Structures are given as C-alpha cells and as structure tokens.
Design brief:
37% helix, alpha+beta, 230 residues, EC 2.3.1.61 (chains A, B), seven-stranded mixed sheet, 3 chains, part of a larger assembly, globular, lipoyl (chains A, B)
C-alpha cells in the first residue's frame, strides 16, 4: 500500500549485516549470571566513586574488564578472520552499543587492557557525550576487535545478537530480574542476568566459546577474582 | 538405505524457506510470561463465553489482540521489505498455524484490528473447519503481514520459528508449565509460558523487537491493559 | 420553565425506581494501579464516569427498548447511543450530550468529558450541545448521597443514579468483610418498560461493573 524508498545508508547497513550473516558461521551459546555481588558493591560504593572521579559507577566497566581478561586468556577470539588469515590483535579494542538520535551507534574503545574502571567510565561518558552532540567522527567507529551489546536496558530476558564484522564474536547483555535460584542448596530470590555469546564457528569451536563465557561468568560472580587475576 | 524422491510441493517449501534464510537477517529474542491471570479469567468465564457465542474460549484470541495492539504501536513490524523498500500495511493480517490432514497450514485473518475476541474465535473456528474439510482456498493463505505460531500444542519449551515470507517477524508460542517464579520477592509455583520472537535485523533493530515483545508480555500479563489500551 | 418541564416529565412518564448494590472494589483497584499510566498515555485523568458509560452502552445494546424513547403515540428506537452526564458548573448542574458512545473507548470518553466540562465551567457550551441524548447518568455521589430517586430527563425513559462509595460490611465467600460499596438507582418509565426489563438491565450493568474483564469478553 504505502511505500518508502530506503535510504542508501540504511540499505548499506542491511547489506553489511547480510554479508556478516553469509561470511561467518553464526551461532550462540549462553550462560547465567548472579549479578548480586557486583550489584551490592555498586550500591555500596557508587557515591564514593561518583564523588572521586566525577562520574557515576555504571555496569559497563565491569563487563569491559572481564572481557579484556578473558580475551587475554583466549588469543583466538580477539583475533579477526579475514580473506585467508587470522589477524591476531595484540591490543583489546572493545565496541559498545549506545542509543542515538539516529538509532544505534557503536563507538570503539581502544587499549582497554590497561584502562581502570574509572577510566573506562570516563571514556564511556566522553563518547556518549560525543554521541549526544552527534560529534562522533567516523573513525571513532573503526578499529574494533570485539563488541558488547546491551539489549537489557530495553528489557530482553535473553536473545541472539549479531556480530559486527569483521569481529568473530560479541556478547549480548540482558535485563536483570529476580528469579528463583539455588544458593547453597536452597531456593532463594536472586538477581539474575542472562548472557549470550554469538560467535563464528569457522575458526572458533564450541570449547573456546564456552570456556570464554564460563570464565567471564566466574569472574563476574566475584569481582575480587580480577584483583587476584584468577 | 532406501530412496524417496520428494514432492515438488515440499521442494518449493524447502526452497522458499532457504530463500527466507538468505534474504532476511534471521535472529530471535525471548521473553517469559506469567499466564496466570489470563488462564484464571479464561477458566472462570469459559462456560459463559461458549454459551454466549457457541465457541469455546481458547488462547489464540488473546495473542491476536496483543499482536494487533503492539503492531499498532510498531508500524515497521507490521510492514515488509520488497527488494528496495518498506511497504507499510495500513491493515493487520495474521497467519495462524493450525493442524490439518496434512498438518501445519497458515490461513490469514484479516482486519484483526477491529476483530473482537468472540469473533476472533469464530474466525479461527471457520478457517480451521475449512482446514479439517480441506476446503481451504489457496488465497486464504495469501495476504498475511505477521504470523503467530503455536509450538506449545506439542510441548516445546522454546525454539526458533521461521517467518513466513514476505513478513519480517513471527511469534513462537510454547507449552505452559509450572515453574518456580518470583512474586513480591518470594519463590512460588507459577505456570509460565516462553515466548520467542524471530525477526529480520535488516530493517528491525534489536530495540524495536525487544520493545515489541516486552509490550506484548505486559499486555498479556494484565487484560485490563487491553481494556485501557495501555 | 425548568420546574414546569420537570412537572410535565413527572406527569407524562410512569416514573418509578429500582435499586442494586455494587462491590466497586475491582474497578477502583485497577484504577488505583493504572491511573498514572493512563493519564500519562492520554493526557487526561482516569475518573469513574467512563466505565459506567461503557457498561450502559453495552447493556443498552442488550436492551433496545431502554435506548428507545416514548413520544406522542410511538416508540422511537435509536440506532445510536447518546448519554447525558450531570456535571456541576457556575450555573449549577448541566447535562451535555455524549454522542456515538457505542464506539468511544475509555480514553476517548475521558477526553470528551474533560472538554465538555471545560466548556461548562467557562460557559462556552452551546445549547445544542445538551440536545440529542437518549439516556442520562447522574452522579449524586459527588456530594455524598447514600441513594435517592433522581428525576428522568425527558424525553428519555431511564436514568442511572450514582452514589457515594463507603466501606460497609459485605459477604465474600460467606465471610463478613469490609467492602467499599456503591448503591445504584434506576428511575424509569413503566408505561413502556416493565419491571423485568429494568431489573435485568441494572443487574447486567452490575455484573459488568464488578468484573471489568466482562467488557473485554463482551459478556
């Protein structure tokens, strides 16, 4: 009935997503996470963090740190698959999804391997401010090695996200909700977050992906494990 | 061991399903739904309803009404992509999966935007009676803009349905089962239903799909929300 | 003129009243839950009138004669459902006519009520705006009437009388409990409407009220 000619930019986006579909063996694995520990730590020290570094303590920094550690444990997933070669990245360049007046825009955070939580939050706020002003350069969206998506801010229980090419895997975050959960053999109310990991099976087998995501889950269940590097 | 040449009908079916895979960026999100209130009202008022209209109060009508409301909130999802464009449909047409002497067949229910629960049941009964009699004209399967599937009649916990072309979304229903759930911060036995939503990412981003499904879940959790078009 | 017209209405129609009780709990519960959402969604408060209008329109679809009006020698059935609503103004009670209520939804009913009340307070209501009704819903409960015998607005044949909700002892599953109850009045013309039609009409109205899901199920 009613027709609208698609903008060449958004057609280009759709075609790039189709290319990512065809080129990479898309599949997803999942793990569950009791966010309780990090939630309590944030609820306790958010005022201190915000006053010390002039910026609130969100959730993103913890996932960024966990992903960087796990990627250091997994040299293949951070790497990118190309025409005939594995491009092993010595540096961790994570990508973050933030809402925009133009839809969804994904900046790039570089050398997250050395960033501290306060610095991660500072970078996030800086790039979000750029996005709000629409003063984000196109080069700010290039140079990535992995991507973390946030569907949970909008309330998804869990789902399958699509990797940004040429990256080989992404993490898909989901809404925290209180669900029954066994703790020390007792059913208790627990704030649980569902985690999805979509990856390329052409170069990453099941074992690497599941170990990666299980390691992330273990790291996030006890933030002290980062402090102990275990 | 033995060979069986397939029917050209099933060859067409498989080929068009593969075309669906190649054309649309197939991905799925998920949600959980405490169907308790709806089955309570259904169990209470089914005798009155069936005595009032001659048709038993099933479950499809609630999903149809929820989908019509949510699609009225989501013009893009009702629409479809045709090789360069989006054709927004001013009307709501839903394919429904119903068993037959062959099995799953999808008639189209038209102008559901105005159709009321009793008349929804009447329409479903008429088309599914055509289904048993195998007196379904081929054009009865032509005209749909969205599809509601029912895998729960056979007992799937949750799966990944395929959209019927040229539509861009499909809902997958699943078997109701008593599971632990949190009510007011307590673990209780709650009959829950898993909902899967498979859609095309080329035109529908994750945010649209998750808002669509979350709104549907909220709508179904309280029929009073339909009563208040909230 | 008003007094003489009311006297003529008394002399013409066989005015008489029946009554029913109503456990109003469910509807005020859902209203208290969703009033913020409704007001934010449609820019208008969620009062009480709209639900009664919807119930009356449904039950009048079930009762064609009550919608109809009695005239010189004929009954004039109505394909439309028009309802007068009593609202206070700087000149006292005034009854605007709500038209084609058979299709109005709760938000639309609230919008109509709000715009007509705004017209009423500002006295920007045309006289024709109070013409066309086929039934009237009065609300004496805004002041605190327990129950009463309201006077029908001619040429209409029936009227609803709202009354103040109060917590009263009531039986639920054979248990005496504190229940917020509204008492209902129904003054109608017996010349053409017998007692059975009026009582079935009001009882169906009641049933619709205590279970708002019944509107969803058109039962």
């Amino acid at each position: 009935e009613t027709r609208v000619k698609m903008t060449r930019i958004r057609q280009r986006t759709a075609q790039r997503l189709k290319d990512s579909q065809n080129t990479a063996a898309m599949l997803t694995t999942f793990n569950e996470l009791d966010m309780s520990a990090l939630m309590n730590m944030r609820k306790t020290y958010k005022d201190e963090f915000e006053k010390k570094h002039g910026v609130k303590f969100g959730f993103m920094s913890a996932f960024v740190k966990a992903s960087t550690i796990a990627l250091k444990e997994q040299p293949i997933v951070n790497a990118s698959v190309e025409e005939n070669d594995i491009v092993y990245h010595n540096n961790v360049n994570i990508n973050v999804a933030v809402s925009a007046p133009r839809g969804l825009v994904v900046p790039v955070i570089r050398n997250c391997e050395n960033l501290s939580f306060a610095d991660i939050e500072k970078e996030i706020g800086r790039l979000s401010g750029l996005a709000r002003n629409d003063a984000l350069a196109i080069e700010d969206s290039i140079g990535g090695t992995f991507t973390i998506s946030n569907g949970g801010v909008f309330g998804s229980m869990f789902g399958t996200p699509i990797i940004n090419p040429p990256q080989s895997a992404i993490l898909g975050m989901h809404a925290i909700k209180d669900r029954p959960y066994v703790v020390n053999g007792q059913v208790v109310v627990r704030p649980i977050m569902y985690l999805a990991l979509t990856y390329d099976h052409r170069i990453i087998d099941g074992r690497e992906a599941v170990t990666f995501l299980k390691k992330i889950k273990d790291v996030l269940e006890n933030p002290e494990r980062i402090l102990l590097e275990l």
